[PDB]
Amino acid sequence: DIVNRKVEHVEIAAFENVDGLSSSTFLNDVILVHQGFPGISFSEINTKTKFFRKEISVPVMVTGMTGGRNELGRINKIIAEVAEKFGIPMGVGSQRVAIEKAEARESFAIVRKVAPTIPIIANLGMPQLVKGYGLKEFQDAIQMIEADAIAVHLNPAQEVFQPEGEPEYQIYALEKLRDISKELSVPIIVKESGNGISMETAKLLYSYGIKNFDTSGQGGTNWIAIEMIRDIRRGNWKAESAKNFLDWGVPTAASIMEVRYSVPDSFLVGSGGIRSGLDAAKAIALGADIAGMALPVLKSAIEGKESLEQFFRKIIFELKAAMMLTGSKDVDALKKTSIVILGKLKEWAEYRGINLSIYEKVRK
Amino acid sequence: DIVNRKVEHVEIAAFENVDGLSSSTFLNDVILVHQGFPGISFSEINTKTKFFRKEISVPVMVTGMTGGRNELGRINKIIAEVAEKFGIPMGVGSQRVAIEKAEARESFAIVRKVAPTIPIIANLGMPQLVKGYGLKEFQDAIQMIEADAIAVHLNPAQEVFQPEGEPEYQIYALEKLRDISKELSVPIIVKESGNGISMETAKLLYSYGIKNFDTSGQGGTNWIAIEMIRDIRRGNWKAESAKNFLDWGVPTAASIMEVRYSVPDSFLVGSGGIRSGLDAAKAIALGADIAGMALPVLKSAIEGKESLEQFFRKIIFELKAAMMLTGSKDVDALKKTSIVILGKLKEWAEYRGINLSIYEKVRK
Amino acid sequence: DIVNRKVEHVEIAAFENVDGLSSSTFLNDVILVHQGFPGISFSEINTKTKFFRKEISVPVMVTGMTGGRNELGRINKIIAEVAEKFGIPMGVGSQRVAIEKAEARESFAIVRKVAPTIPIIANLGMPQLVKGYGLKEFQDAIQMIEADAIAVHLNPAQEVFQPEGEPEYQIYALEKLRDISKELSVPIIVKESGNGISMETAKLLYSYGIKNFDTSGQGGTNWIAIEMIRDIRRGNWKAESAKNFLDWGVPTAASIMEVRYSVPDSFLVGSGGIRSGLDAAKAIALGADIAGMALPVLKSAIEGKESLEQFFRKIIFELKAAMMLTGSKDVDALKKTSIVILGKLKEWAEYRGINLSIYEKVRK
Amino acid sequence: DIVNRKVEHVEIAAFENVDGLSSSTFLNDVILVHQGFPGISFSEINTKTKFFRKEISVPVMVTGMTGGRNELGRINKIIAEVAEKFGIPMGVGSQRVAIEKAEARESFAIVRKVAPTIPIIANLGMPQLVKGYGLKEFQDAIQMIEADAIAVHLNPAQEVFQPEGEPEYQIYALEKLRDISKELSVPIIVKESGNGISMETAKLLYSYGIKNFDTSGQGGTNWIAIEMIRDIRRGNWKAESAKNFLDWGVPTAASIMEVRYSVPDSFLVGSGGIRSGLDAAKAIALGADIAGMALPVLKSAIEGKESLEQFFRKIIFELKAAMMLTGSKDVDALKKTSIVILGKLKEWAEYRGINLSIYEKVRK
Numbered sequence A, B, C, D: 001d002i003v004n005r006k007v008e009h010v011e012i013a014a015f016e017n018v019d020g021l022s023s024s025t026f027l028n029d030v031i032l033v034h035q036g037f038p039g040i041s042f043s044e045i046n047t048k049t050k051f052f053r054k055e056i057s058v059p060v061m062v063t064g065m066t067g068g069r070n071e072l073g074r075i076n077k078i079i080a081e082v083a084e085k086f087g088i089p090m091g092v093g094s095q096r097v098a099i100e101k102a103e104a105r106e107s108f109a110i111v112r113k114v115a116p117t118i119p120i121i122a123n124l125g126m127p128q129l130v131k132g133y134g135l136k137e138f139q140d141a142i143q144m145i146e147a148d149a150i151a152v153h154l155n156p157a158q159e160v161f162q163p164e165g166e167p168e169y170q171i172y173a174l175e176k177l178r179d180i181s182k183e184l185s186v187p188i189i190v191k192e193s194g195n196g197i198s199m200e201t202a203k204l205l206y207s208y209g210i211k212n213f214d215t216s217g218q219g220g221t222n223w224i225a226i227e228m229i230r231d232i233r234r235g236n237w238k239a240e241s242a243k244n245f246l247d248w249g250v251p252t253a254a255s256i257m258e259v260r261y262s263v264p265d266s267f268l269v270g271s272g273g274i275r276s277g278l279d280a281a282k283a284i285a286l287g288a289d290i291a292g293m294a295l296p297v298l299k300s301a302i303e304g305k306e307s308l309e310q311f312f313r314k315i316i317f318e319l320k321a322a323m324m325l326t327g328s329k330d331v332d333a334l335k336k337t338s339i340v341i342l343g344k345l346k347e348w349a350e351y352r353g354i355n356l357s358i359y360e361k362v363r364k
């Protein structure tokens, strides 16, 4: 029945109107500067990059989504075998469901069976930390899929509107996370869930030892909208209130700038609303080390293995086109390519004290 | 006559299209920065605050609306008994009608019968001060409902277009107000009525001893529109002129910044177009001490006691959501939470010499 | 057959869609700040002002329009007797047509018969000066209506697209104008015709002794559009080209700022798209000494004497409402009232080197 | 078969919806300051200018388009004879086709037969330079039409999406172009193809001896869109990806600023979306020495000789109207006329470090 929520999440995300609903990534305010003399050939473009101790083929990851029941495992299986084929990292959805129910384990474990080489990323929610999870649950989440890192998700906006939500984010949870990180043999990434990471949140996590961030900004999947729908469906009055919050959060573009600026040495996944290899290029150019995606991967996976393979060819082709067209022979060159920032993202950055000169230098 | 106007005001406000008609609060240029790690739990959020010598449950008030006839008292009764239940302050509509006609008194006094503990705020119009009111009329408006404060309304835009309006705002009125304040045993609040308080107006009032303000800016009920409609109804030619003034006034968000900036120690109600607990949180984060609402409370009261209780539950939920999602454990924390100011509001503040650095410290 | 042009002009302005066509005044970027405590009563508002050696009742003028044939005279007669009634100045249309044909004289002279006391303003085009008019033609235009001033119009944009247009603006004409002005017993005003006066044009005229300006900016009557329509009517190919120029010119608001900034001691009519007393109040607040109107006066005059009387009552009411609601007891106070400049107008002024600080000192 | 591409190119450009598709020149952010007193007569405006060693009648050129087959030749013939009649320069389409196929030569050579006096500009693609072209190919393209210059085109965006495209832009090609330019008896112009020249690209080319640039920015013919359409037609999957890149590139107005700013002594053609003589005036005012056009000349030429003659009368009329209305007696005066830059173009220039003060001095 946490199982039911897992199913409902997929169903609404895949089939209802929640992608970018009343929200915006601010990526339209980011322009990559065209170079009519690139100085390179398309074929020499190198998209290889580091993901902790592994090498990955493309600076893109699939971020965590699902697991909990056997038809969710079959979706995981499809994503995983394509991810493995393409050499891209994959996170799984929250594994709480499997900690609570042993029959749910196999829908996660299937990932590692079919993708023995790529980084795989475990997932647990911050609220479970204030509610009694500790080391053991972490190591269990990790060994279940022989994970290379574990993501801990921030979802307070979701929890607030979720019919059976748990909005508990007491400071003690970070004391615990920091102790646990002592004992883990893989790194921790803190990721959001559609509402983005701000400078204050980034600096607070950093002060507890967190070095790896996944922006999951607003503009992509709208998790407040998903829970709103689940509220309409139950006739739960929170639904009209969630409607007033549909545009709540830090936009992806702004969150990439905020995290890069306030924690210049972070390893940074720029995600929330990444829908094309152009978006992924902008995310990286702006300051991310890698671009994350979830929803469009889900929708293709549902359509099948070949649809998902095609989706990835397309993303990769687009990313490379953007590198071609900015004269960027590799990922490091894209991270320093010339951009223009306009409109509302410019005004956000200015109001937040983001000095563009030092910004430019920090993103590189 | 005056009673007919009182009923027509309610009916037009309640049932015609005047809410935000060709006007704007500028609150869409205000963004509360999401914090994916709040550092608190939902259940620990504290919404209590000061309202002069009383404590109120939530930093929200219902501002003055009606009174004058028995069906208007029945609306006052509904508002008052729900306000009392939720522990929130309530102002009554202009009591001039009851000063002029003893049969109108009971439609005010009913408020205190059903709401013995909450702050109750009296109401008189500034024009009546240039036209012969003084101490006695103030003390009467007060004792009629054993008020904890009295509001004096500014409504020159309304009076200019009102068919039987009285646009008299001689400086002598403030000389009188200040002398009256000497002798009153409750504080005075000066409030506008849909057209907002500017820095020059705030400073001028302050120079006469007024320390309590209620912005009532444009963007919510449009009182120029209400009178325009009364003019169309009478075939009074002022109607076409009112139409040219529909967007006249200081937008609520700009008025909050102006007052807090030019009178930093003010006690400040941010109102005019507050329609959700998100709007209330914005008003407060921007500089108000409390958020005020009138029209949506009127529309729900008309639907009934249960509709209005539901309305309040919703507003409070929303407010707390916004506190949750900004890491604000209490109202003082919300007053200092991180914001972003964009677009037209930003341009307003810059043109008006509102130095943002100093704005920040003053709102805190 | 210039007389045909004269009638076509009135016909197209009055009945085709040329008012504000693809053009803008920039007055929506100017806000007058609302003062909830005006410090005055409506009844004490004084709209009187100076118009050269006369006193006028309201800071508004009717700018020049027509004359040429007897039905045009009957329009002039209607405008003139209402203008006299209200104590406002009136300019006539270009009198070239009456210099060229004696039968046209009476359609101008009729103005002075029916309006013995108000300022009356003669009119001649600049191109006639380059092409041979001199002193005598000026004095004849003047005596024909016992004018208190003569306007010389700048219409190169019009002349460029006008089928029989004369786009001759050789610098010599200004030498002549200056010599003429030596010998005239009444002042010269230089006015545009829908395309506005720039700082360069204003400083150039000033260097030749011109101190009185009428901005006639874009946003109101679009004379390029009028000529485009006359071009379509003749199947003259200039019509398509005129279409590309529909938004050509300095917007009225930007023209007011430019002229007041570059010639601080000018006597300044702000006109072009003034359609309401609020527009007239903005124009003055921004820097003009008086607001001018032509098209809407033309349209009401056609409908008749009483419709035009009503038109003026409305304008005057509107102007005074703006004064009331900014706390401006008189015209000099309105010239110093608080404003906000936003958006495109702001970006215009910044780009053109209009230092806002010095701007505010200079308009007062 | 390259010949098929040549035909399809013309056919899609002339008859599909690709002019300004999802793209923008930014020319609407550029305003020419109207001068109500021009100081000149229309008839004295002088549009003569230099094009390398020749004089041309008007500061406009037709940029290269087509050639390859005899119906393409007949379009080249029409353009050429009108170009000759009006005294304007004409570039031809990429002559690769005629290097590869002797039967395609005559469709280029026809240009010189019918236009013995005007400047004629040859055309080759940068990618053919990385892939083996050298001096001889350059000299053949030149002698084939007795060219006065040869344009080399930058089209990586196009090549990336083109079904049979060749996205090779290795730095070596510039070493070769530099050596070739040693040996050529005519100058080289480097032009883009709808995606614009940036300051990095311009400075790089300059460092290799290139002093003549043709911006061909975004906002006019969208070459990504043309290839996208060829991809739809073949069912090539690159189509959906092209669609994500529709708004890729430097807008014409920004490109002109960037090239003029970064290479102040460049000879500069401003092109890409020039559709009227007002556009042409803006491009020159902003920094270009000449305005270039392709697509609308193609569409008129297809309709016939008289339609193209009319097209040019109209452009020239428009150009001269903009000169008249800015008080510009000649091209040098238009280069230094007063402008206003707003909106996104302003923000582009600011973000890219284009100091407007120095920009003004350099543009003049």
Ligand SMILES: Cc1cc2c(cc1C)N(C[C@H](O)[C@H](O)[C@H](O)COP(=O)(O)O)c1[nH]c(=O)[nH]c(=O)c1N2
Binding pocket: A009, A010, A013, A014, A063, A064, A065, A066, A092, A093, A094, A095, A123, A151, A152, A153, A191, A192, A193, A194, A216, A217, A219, A220, A221, A271, A272, A273, A274, A292, A293, A294, A295, A296, A298
């Ligand atoms: C079906 C579904 C289910 C979930 C997710 C998403 C989707 C679409 N996401 C959030 C996801 O990882 C990502 O942060 C956001 O969806 C933003 O990225 P997109 O806009 O979806 O590309 C998510 N996040 C996480 O940390 N734990 C989880 O269990 C889930 N569950």
Ligand SMILES: Cc1cc2c(cc1C)N(C[C@H](O)[C@H](O)[C@H](O)COP(=O)(O)O)c1[nH]c(=O)[nH]c(=O)c1N2
Binding pocket: B009, B010, B013, B063, B064, B065, B066, B092, B093, B094, B095, B123, B151, B152, B153, B191, B192, B193, B194, B216, B217, B219, B220, B221, B271, B272, B273, B274, B292, B293, B294, B295, B296, B298
């Ligand atoms: C039916 C009605 C009647 C009145 C009002 C409003 C309404 C809706 N308001 C103005 C009100 O207190 C408030 O300042 C504005 O209406 C702006 O807030 P809202 O946008 O309505 O929340 C009001 N204010 C006041 O000072 N004296 C009055 O008697 C009235 N009367």
Ligand SMILES: Cc1cc2c(cc1C)N(C[C@H](O)[C@H](O)[C@H](O)COP(=O)(O)O)c1[nH]c(=O)[nH]c(=O)c1N2
Binding pocket: C009, C010, C013, C063, C064, C065, C066, C092, C093, C094, C123, C151, C152, C153, C191, C192, C193, C194, C216, C217, C219, C220, C221, C271, C272, C273, C274, C292, C293, C294, C295, C296, C298
């Ligand atoms: C019918 C008609 C005819 C004329 C005009 C206008 C109208 C509508 N205008 C221009 C007018 O005085 C004014 O400068 C512009 O029309 C801008 O003001 P409005 O937008 O019309 O208020 C005018 N101006 C002028 O100086 N001499 C003229 O003869 C004319 N003719």
Ligand SMILES: Cc1cc2c(cc1C)N(C[C@H](O)[C@H](O)[C@H](O)COP(=O)(O)O)c1[nH]c(=O)[nH]c(=O)c1N2
Binding pocket: D009, D010, D013, D063, D064, D065, D066, D092, D093, D094, D095, D123, D151, D152, D153, D191, D192, D193, D194, D216, D217, D219, D220, D221, D271, D272, D273, D274, D292, D293, D294, D295, D296, D298
């Ligand atoms: C049908 C057709 C075909 C070509 C072109 C254009 C058109 C419409 N253009 C690009 C052209 O010269 C110009 O740079 C762009 O089209 C932008 O100008 P417009 O927006 O078309 O005015 C072009 N450029 C070039 O250098 N070599 C070429 O062979 C072609 N071919």
Ligand SMILES: C=C(C)CCOP(=O)(O)OP(=O)(O)O
Binding pocket: A002, A005, A094, A095, A096, A097, A124, A125, A153, A154, A155, A158, A193, A223
């Ligand atoms: C987008 C995400 C973070 C969805 C998971 O939310 P849940 O709140 O349903 O996750 P668990 O409680 O099962 O950890």
Ligand SMILES: C=C(C)CCOP(=O)(O)OP(=O)(O)O
Binding pocket: B002, B005, B006, B094, B095, B096, B097, B124, B125, B153, B155, B158, B193, B223
């Ligand atoms: C919005 C407001 C302030 C309504 C009161 O206006 P009135 O002008 O009808 O109030 P009184 O004259 O009865 O004081």
Ligand SMILES: C=C(C)CCOP(=O)(O)OP(=O)(O)O
Binding pocket: C002, C005, C006, C094, C095, C096, C097, C124, C125, C153, C155, C158, C193, C223
């Ligand atoms: C807006 C104006 C100036 C209308 C008069 O234009 P014309 O060019 O027809 O006037 P004259 O030649 O008769 O002076």
Ligand SMILES: C=C(C)CCOP(=O)(O)OP(=O)(O)O
Binding pocket: D002, D005, D006, D094, D095, D096, D097, D124, D125, D153, D154, D155, D158, D193, D223
């Ligand atoms: C806008 C341009 C550059 C059209 C010609 O491109 P092509 O790519 O077809 O030209 P070639 O390969 O024939 O040189």
Ligand SMILES: [Mg+2]
Binding pocket: A125, A127, A159, A166
């Ligand atoms: Mg949860």
Ligand SMILES: [Mg+2]
Binding pocket: B125, B127, B159, B166
């Ligand atoms: Mg009143």
Ligand SMILES: [Mg+2]
Binding pocket: C125, C127, C155, C159, C166
């Ligand atoms: Mg004329």
Ligand SMILES: [Mg+2]
Binding pocket: D125, D127, D159, D166
């Ligand atoms: Mg090619």
